[PDB]
């Protein structure tokens, strides 16, 4: 703050650090899993 007669040393004592983690809207996946499986047990 640095305006009173008594203030704090560094901004890290004026700040609240949060572990909350956020992400934006992400693209969707469509053609990844629309076809049907074909299991091969050989080469």
């Amino acid at each position: 703050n640095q305006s009173s007669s008594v203030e704090v040393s560094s901004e890290s004592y004026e700040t609240i650090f949060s572990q909350r983690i956020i992400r934006d809207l992400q693209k969707e996946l469509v053609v990844g899993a629309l076809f049907e499986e074909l299991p091969m047990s050989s080469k």
Partner: protein, 253 residues
């Protein structure tokens, strides 16, 4: 200040060749990631008014409730105006300023003089610049100026009943949903002129209101001048998470 963490982007795998089965290249490549952060702040809004202890007697009716109500309503007017189009110098950056500085100011062909009106198709064309967030309709807010609303009321594409269902203008005189977007009229838009915004669409969930203290009223008695000072202060700001979620249309240059 308050800080939150933003998770990084995505990574890619690799297609290993068939000749690398007997070497360490079989296992592929590396995927690295680094976090980031953002911060929020606040701004202070203040106003005051004085009432000498002799004008109270020097009148037939009281004048205090008028003073207090004027204080509160002035405070609300200023905060809403600043949220509309406040700059960044000591005041929150207004929605229109955010849209302009994000290059989301779509310059339409409507004219400020009045040669060309504002059509509903033009309003709906702004949804493109929203990008990925424009696909969903329940998460959007539409706000139009007064003159935009009056030009909407005279749209050739909404007159006939056969053109637009039962909500034809000729039968109602009012316009409700435009292209599925509800219509809200606000009068705090800038003055009507060339290159000025007349409608804005925002992603509602992207914006937050950091706030430290609410509106507080303090009363001080100044016996040295025989007055009754009143003080009203608050600390708010308008902040958003990411750099997207707003689009604004403007008249032609």
């Amino acid at each position: 200040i308050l800080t939150m963490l933003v998770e990084p982007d995505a990574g890619r795998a690799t297609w290993v060749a068939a000749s690398a089965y007997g070497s360490d290249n079989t296992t592929g490549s590396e995927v690295t990631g680094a976090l980031t952060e953002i911060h929020f702040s606040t701004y202070k809004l203040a106003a005051k008014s004085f009432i000498t202890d002799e004008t109270e007697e020097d009148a037939i009716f009281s004048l205090l409730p008028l003073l207090r109500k004027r204080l509160i309503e002035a405070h609300a007017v200023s905060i809403e105006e600043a949220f509309m189009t406040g700059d960044g110098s000591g005041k929150p950056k207004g929605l229109l300023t955010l849209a302009s500085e994000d290059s989301a100011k779509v310059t339409t062909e409507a004219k400020a003089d009045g040669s060309v009106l504002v059509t509903a198709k033009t309003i709906s064309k702004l949804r493109r610049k929203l990008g990925r967030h424009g696909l969903k309709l329940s998460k959007l807010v539409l706000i139009v100026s007064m003159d935009a609303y009056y030009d909407l009321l005279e749209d050739e594409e909404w007159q006939d009943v056969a053109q637009v269902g039962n909500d034809a203008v000729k039968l109602q005189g009012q316009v409700g949903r435009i292209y599925g977007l509800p219509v809200v009229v606000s009068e705090y838009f800038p003055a009507k002129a060339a290159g000025k915004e007349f409608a804005v669409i925002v992603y509602k969930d992207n914006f937050v209101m950091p706030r430290q203290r609410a509106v507080t009223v303090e009363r001080e008695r100044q016996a040295g001048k025989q007055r009754d000072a009143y003080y009203v202060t608050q600390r708010v700001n308008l902040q958003r998470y990411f750099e997207n979620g707003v689009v604004s249309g403007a008249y032609a240059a």
